[PDB]
């Protein structure tokens, strides 16, 4: 019935690993969304600058 102490401790460790992985995924997704955003903004900046220079 899952009441074993060692099994419960191992389950807790695995759930900690799962939760850290979910946190790391969210952090990395936000970071690379920001990377895509800054790249897109720089692309627009360069396009407008080249337009005006032309």
């Amino acid at each position: 019935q899952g009441d074993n102490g060692q099994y419960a401790r191992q389950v807790r460790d695995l759930e900690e690993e799962r939760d850290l992985e979910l946190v790391r995924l969210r952090l990395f997704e936000e970071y690379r969304v920001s990377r895509s955003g800054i790249e897109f903004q720089e692309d627009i900046e360069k396009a407008k600058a080249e337009h005006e220079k032309l």
């Binding site: 099994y7 191992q10 389950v11 695995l14 759930e15 690993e17 799962r18 992985e21 979910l22 995924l25």
Partner: peptide, 13 residues
Amino acid sequence: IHQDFHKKVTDLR
């Protein structure tokens, strides 16, 4: 990740 956790817990039990 959820699938990996479920597999790991089943294997360990």
